[PDB]
TrEMBL record, chain A:
This is Capsid triplex subunit 1. It comes from the Viruses.
Automatic annotation (TrEMBL), chain B:
It comes from Human cytomegalovirus. It comes from the Viruses. This is Major capsid protein.
TrEMBL record, chain D:
GO terms for molecular function: structural molecule activity. Keywords: Capsid protein, Host nucleus, Virion. GO terms for cellular component: viral capsid. This is Capsid triplex subunit 2. InterPro entries: Herpes_capsid_2. The lineage of its organism: Viruses, Duplodnaviria, Heunggongvirae, Peploviricota, Herviviricetes.
Length: 112, 98, 49, 296, 87, 302
């Protein structure tokens, strides 16, 4: 899907891993969770979380803003990473879909 | 793997065993008594200063700073001797009874 | 043919039977790695069973 | 890899009939040794009065699990599972399983049909779904936090409410962590550690947002500092004027604060995390065994 | 605040009476004020009695009398003269 | 895909192939994951650059994929990328004591202390330096000491930070001693401090009115060794704050245990988030070690 797909890359890495990422933007009154499918050349989890923190610090400040504006309501999380697998840089097809897809149903790994 | 097994076919005690001949003494046969402040390491006096004075006057050192091996020393039973440098008399062995 | 040569050691309730009994050391959290050589005469579950 | 677990004792055929009901169950082993005795089998090597719970969960992180495969008359073929391939395990714990649930492993405190020898017993860990595992983990930890003040009665009603556990066909009695008005020692260290971490989290961020916002200071740091001000204002509202934090601190006391914070954070990983072991597949009828993938 | 900073013998029995002392709040009417000050006062005097470690009475169903603590007896007579003059 | 071939540029002496053939079943980090590579992309010497930062090598080494060395035949070494869950063997070049049942991590090469400079492979302007396959508690201690050296060193003169860092760089692990060579303040280290600060403040907010005072309750109640060793720290804290007395705690007023369960759940979320910044992933879990600690086998990928 062209709407949910995004990256921060020239997508010229060879092995493109994929990552499901959702967020929790509290600029709306209840929540406006931006669901996203994210490819990346980067494969390690932690440094990817750091790059995502560098990209999504607006949702973090919105998270702390929800915490100060409503103490009784508990803030649940900020976002959850889960890898799905990996492909090749030519396997994309502009709705963007993949011809081969190795699967890896990883874990719900949260982050703030 | 050879799965052997054996059956005793004795009415009483066939086999004997004699302590025959001694080579050496592995221990110290010394007077270094068993120090209680490791075998009961968590217990301290309620007043802080008197416990500081007692551990000063007995030579036994307090925990210097709180690290994970000290926590494992308090919770588990661990290697809390931190063994001597030179060892010319083998092991060390005694205890206490009032 | 006496009563007891050490009244601070024999009866269940003295200091040594709560200092060297293994089943009484567990009520005080002792360092398990040390071999107390006196701990063979002071037990009861090892002795009476 | 195979493990052969023999018994030095005499094995009664009635106990063989008991043991063949354990055709495929999870058992832990302290070290991967090819030929092993039965004294290292199970969790009877760690049971006592004084250690209790957290010691077993700590010692379960580094143990390797295995499955019984077949039964010879004096040795058991234990089979260490490998990742990705799937096996059929048995539902040992009291909770029944459902499809798709991630299975975690927990020491059986409540346990109460086991192999019986003269000094050695067999005890098998509970194979519980992960949300129930985290649920009873935080239930036991809050029940350990409340352990000092049960002389009052609404807190007795609170721990009585926390005593039971709601799940599908499940009313368990989680055992009391405090025994004879005293806490067992590892839970005492655990609750003390999270208490002091909660204290130093309050008492050090008031310095470190100042120490860190002399760099690029985004709105994250600003709202963090206002939240810290809210915490300070709601903390010392019933107190005299202010805590009045100073700026010129000795270095080594700060080192002893921060190292203590991290080293007591280090001994809480066994409670905050969960080893997922099995992701279950299609279950047998009446839910007494299931084919499961070993996600280890 | 003087009770929290003070070291007593035991802390739970001092603690719930201090908690009673934290619940001294009033309304606009004065009918309930004259009955909440007696519970505030019995809590304050049992803190005064337990802070010096003096033996308070512990009969079954017994109340502590509202008494001044550690004063001279002529000062007691003078202060009761003043309170009678208020009466 | 599982096998990759690295070819050398220089001619290889007998000493070169003899040094290489002792490196069978050793670890090699490869960044690129290409099927064929030159030796400039081998190992770690392409990114070894001192006066830059140990956290830089710790960051980029975390992204590089691993392999094992086998079937060396001259002008090719035939590295084999291990896959998940299978049983492989590993020879430790670094002088680290290995114990069974233990889980391993990958760290950049911190020097042993004599500075042996055993490059163990000779080229004209190239070396084969290797990352250290290290047990999990040592790597956890390295990350912890690294973050402590990061947080402490802000806004400090050289004097007190020298007298502290000369104590903090020294580590001990099983009759050994190592140091951290390039501990400098970098950007990734800085953003990890900011996330740790946010997480610690979230732990500060998400504590109830009874978990905060539990250590105070036990300080009234009991006197163990670690009770005193924590009470001195909290007492020095509260004495540097206020010159009054640390108050006895009160009765719990509002008890409604679902708030406490959700409170501890949010505390657990933030504490796992804080804990992941020092914990690295397990890259090898051992099965059995040689009695010489020269090699072992391991059931994990690279």
């Amino acid at each position: 899907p062209k709407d949910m797909y995004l990256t921060w890359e020239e997508t010229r890495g060879r092995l493109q891993y994929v990552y499901l990422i959702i967020v929790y933007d509290y600029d709306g009154p209840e929540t406006r969770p931006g669901i996203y499918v994210l490819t990346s050349s980067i494969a390690h989890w932690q440094t990817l979380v750091d790059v995502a923190r560098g990209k999504f610090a607006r949702e973090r400040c919105s998270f702390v803003n929800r915490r100060i504006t409503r103490p009784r309501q508990i803030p649940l999380c900020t976002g959850v990473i889960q890898k799905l697998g990996w492909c090749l840089a030519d396997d994309i097809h502009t709705v963007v879909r993949l011809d081969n897809f190795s699967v890896e149903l990883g874990d719900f790994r949260e982050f703030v | 793997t050879q799965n052997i097994n054996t059956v005793d076919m004795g009415l009483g005690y066939t086999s004997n065993t004699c302590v025959a001949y001694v080579n050496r003494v592995r221990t110290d046969m010394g007077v270094r008594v068993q120090d209680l402040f490791r075998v009961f390491p968590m217990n301290v006096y309620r007043h802080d200063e008197v416990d500081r004075w007692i551990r000063h006057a007995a030579g036994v050192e307090r925990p210097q700073l709180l690290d994970t091996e000290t926590i494992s020393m308090l919770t588990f039973g661990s290697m809390s001797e931190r063994n001597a440098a030179a060892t010319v008399h083998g092991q060390k062995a005694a205890c206490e009874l009032i | 043919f006496a009563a007891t040569h050490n009244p601070w050691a024999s009866q269940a309730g003295c200091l040594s039977d709560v200092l060297y009994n293994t089943r009484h050391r567990e009520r005080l959290g002792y360092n398990s790695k040390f071999y107390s050589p006196c701990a063979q005469y002071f037990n009861t579950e090892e002795i009476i069973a | 890899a195979n493990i052969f677990c023999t018994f030095d004792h005499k094995l009664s055929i009635a106990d063989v009939g008991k043991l063949t009901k354990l055709v495929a169950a999870v058992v832990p082993i302290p070290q991967r040794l090819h030929l092993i005795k039965h004294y290292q089998l199970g969790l009877h090597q760690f049971v006592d009065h004084t250690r209790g719970y957290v010691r077993l969960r700590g010692l379960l992180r580094n143990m390797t699990l295995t499955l019984m495969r077949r039964v010879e008359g004096n040795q058991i073929l234990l089979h260490v599972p490998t990742h990705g391939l799937l096996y059929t395990v048995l539902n040992t714990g009291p909770v029944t399983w459902e499809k798709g649930d991630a299975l975690c492993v927990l020491p059986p405190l409540f346990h109460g049909n086991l192999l019986t020898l003269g000094q050695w017993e067999l005890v098998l860990p509970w194979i519980v779904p992960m949300p129930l595992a985290l649920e009873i983990n935080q239930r036991l930890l809050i029940m350990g936090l409340f352990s000092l003040d049960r002389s009052y009665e609404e807190v007795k009603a609170a721990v009585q409410q926390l005593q039971t556990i709601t799940f599908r066909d499940a009313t368990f009695t989680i055992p009391d962590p405090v025994i004879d008005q005293h806490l067992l020692i590892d839970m005492k260290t655990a609750c003390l550690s999270m208490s002091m971490v909660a204290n130093l989290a309050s008492e050090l961020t008031m310095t470190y947002v100042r120490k860190l916002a002399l760099e690029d200071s985004s709105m994250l740091l600003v709202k963090c500092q206002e939240l810290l001000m809210r915490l300070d204002r709601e903390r010392s509202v019933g107190e005299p004027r202010t805590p009045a934090r100073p700026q010129h601190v000795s270095p080594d006391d700060e080192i002893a604060r921060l190292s203590a914070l991290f080293v007591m954070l280090r001994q809480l990983d066994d409670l905050i995390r969960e080893q997922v072991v099995f992701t279950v597949c299609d279950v047998s009828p009446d839910n007494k065994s299931a084919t499961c993938i070993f996600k280890g | 605040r003087r009770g929290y900073t003070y070291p007593f013998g035991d802390r739970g029995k001092a603690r719930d009476h201090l908690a009673v002392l934290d619940r001294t709040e009033f309304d606009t009417d004065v009918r309930h004020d004259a009955e909440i000050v007696e519970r505030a006062l019995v809590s304050a005097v049992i803190l005064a009695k337990m802070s010096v470690r003096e033996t308070l009475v512990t009969a079954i169903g017994q109340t502590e009398p509202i008494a001044f603590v550690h004063l001279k007896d002529t000062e007691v007579q003078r202060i009761e003269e003043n309170l009678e003059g208020v009466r």
